[PDB]
């Protein structure tokens, strides 16, 4: 049984400005098997009613999913994506960085 660990990118849909309405994305890809847990966090707390794309896959058979929710960036709030998968001993957390 192959187990491929997810690649993670956390980013905004539109260029970010403090106080301006936007969308936070967590894109997970390159993983196998398909079962995965993805949460979007605001200051360490789970954001509710985050949505996700329908499961699909690339040529190498690895899966990809986009998770997303509306958000308004500010200077003080920290955003993140938390991913768990059979390949991870503990949840992986990737912080949202405006510049990436």
């Amino acid at each position: 049984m192959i187990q491929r660990t997810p690649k993670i990118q956390v980013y905004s849909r539109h260029p970010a400005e403090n106080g301006k309405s936007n969308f936070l994305n967590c894109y997970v890809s390159g993983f196998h098997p398909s079962d995965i847990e993805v949460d979007l966090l605001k200051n360490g707390e789970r954001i509710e009613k985050v949505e996700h794309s329908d499961l699909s896959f690339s040529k190498d058979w690895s899966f990809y999913l986009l998770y997303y929710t509306e958000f308004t960036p500010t200077e003080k709030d920290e955003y993140a994506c938390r991913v768990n998968h059979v390949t991870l001993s503990q949840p992986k957390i990737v912080k949202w960085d405006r510049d990436m």
Binding site: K7, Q9, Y11, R13, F23, N25, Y27, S29, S53, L66, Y68, M100
Partner: peptide, 15 residues
């Protein structure tokens, strides 16, 4: 070079 990613509105992003 990051992998091309969906914006969520049907378009894509890369850097």
């Amino acid at each position: 070079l990051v992998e091309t990613r969906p914006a969520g509105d049907g378009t894509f992003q890369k850097w």
